[PDB]
């Protein structure tokens, strides 16, 4: 665990998001990409419409923003950019529902999403246990997201990061709960189960929000929704972000072959050719029912759903030869 230099909270504290932005981050399909500078000031201006100025305190905000992009490490995918955008998409799901849930459950949500990744190295649960890495032997299943979790409650114990204090004793330990389920469920691994206990619920009627076992996994699908939502962006923004992740599934793919396993074929550079049919079959196993779900749930949510389905067909268009542009 490392911490942030002098002028990078200080500078923050400066920063004020210019007009068109303002609008424009409201949306669902809004890509944060060009504009890097910002990104750290994208989020404080997300933490203050949602849930209020003085929700926490500022000072500790940054810092403790700050530490949370320390504690991404450069890989391709499960960035620092990553973190950020899964927090976006968050903000556009609370503000499309927010009396919903609480100030609690909302500031527990941004700051689940912004760490749900923290210190990852570009290697899957799968690789960790199949070579016994020790993470493995600490955390039996969810092995990444229970890491996460303990990464983030000791980035909140640094000192002057702890943006909970204020709150209670015991709603300080509510949110963390609310933080601690929220990173596990973006363990894929769970989220199959997940939706189809929720499909049942609300196709029987007997889904109620305020009860608190039917609430958890609401929030659990809303966090796989955050986590997935490359897949719902424009069609030229959700294949650049397809590179960086291939880049990251290929380099683990590589490490299996030092080891003498051949790889699964998407983390295969080997089998490029096979993505399209690759990404069709993630569409139809994983995004759509997420997404479709998810809207039944909470229908403001259906723009997801709308662009999620634009882009499968667009992979579609790609298996039929065809593809346009293709810049890298
Ligand atoms: C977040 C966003 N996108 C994801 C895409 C995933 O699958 C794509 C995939 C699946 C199988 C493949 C087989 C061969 C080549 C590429 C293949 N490519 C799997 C997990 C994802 C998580
Ligand atoms: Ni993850
Ligand atoms: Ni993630």
Redesign the pocket.
């Known amino acids: 665990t490392s911490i942030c230099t002098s002028e990078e909270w200080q500078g923050l504290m400066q920063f004020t998001l210019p007009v068109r932005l303002c609008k424009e981050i409201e949306l669902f399909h809004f890509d944060i990409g060009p504009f890097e500078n910002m990104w750290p000031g994208i989020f404080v201006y997300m933490v203050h419409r949602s849930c209020g100025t003085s929700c926490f305190e500022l000072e500790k905000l940054c810092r403790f923003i700050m530490s949370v992009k320390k504690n991404y490490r450069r890989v391709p995918y499960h960035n620092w950019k990553h973190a950020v955008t899964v927090a976006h998409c968050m903000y556009a799901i609370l503000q499309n529902n927010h009396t919903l849930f609480t100030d609690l459950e909302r500031k527990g949500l941004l700051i689940a999403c912004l760490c749900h990744d923290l210190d990852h190295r570009g290697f899957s649960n799968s690789y960790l246990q199949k070579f016994d890495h020790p993470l493995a032997a600490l955390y039996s299943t969810s092995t990444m997201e229970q890491h996460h979790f303990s990464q983030t409650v000791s980035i909140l114990q640094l000192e002057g990061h702890n943006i909970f204090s204020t709150l209670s004793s015991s709603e300080y330990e509510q949110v963390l709960e609310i933080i601690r389920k929220a990173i596990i469920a973006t363990d ?1 691994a769970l989220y199959f189960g997940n939706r189809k206990q929720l499909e049942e619920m609300y196709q029987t009627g007997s889904l109620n929000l305020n009860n608190q076992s039917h609430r958890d996994r609401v929030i659990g699908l809303m966090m796989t929704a955050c ?2 939502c ?2 719902t962006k424009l069609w030229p923004v959700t294949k650049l972000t ?1 590179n960086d ?2 880049a990251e ?1 290929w380099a683990e793919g590589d490490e299996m072959k030092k080891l003498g396993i051949q790889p ?3 983390m ?1 550079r080997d ?2 050719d ?2 399209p ?3 069709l ?2 569409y139809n196993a ?1 995004a759509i029912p997420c997404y479709t779900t998810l809207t039944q749930i909470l229908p403001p949510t259906e723009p997801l759903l709308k662009a999620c389905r634009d882009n499968l067909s667009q992979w579609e268009k790609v298996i039929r030869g065809e593809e346009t542009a293709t810049w890298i």
């Open positions: 894929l986590d997935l490359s897949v397809a992740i291939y599934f699964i074929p998407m295969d089998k490029k096979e993505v049919q690759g990404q079959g993630f994983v």
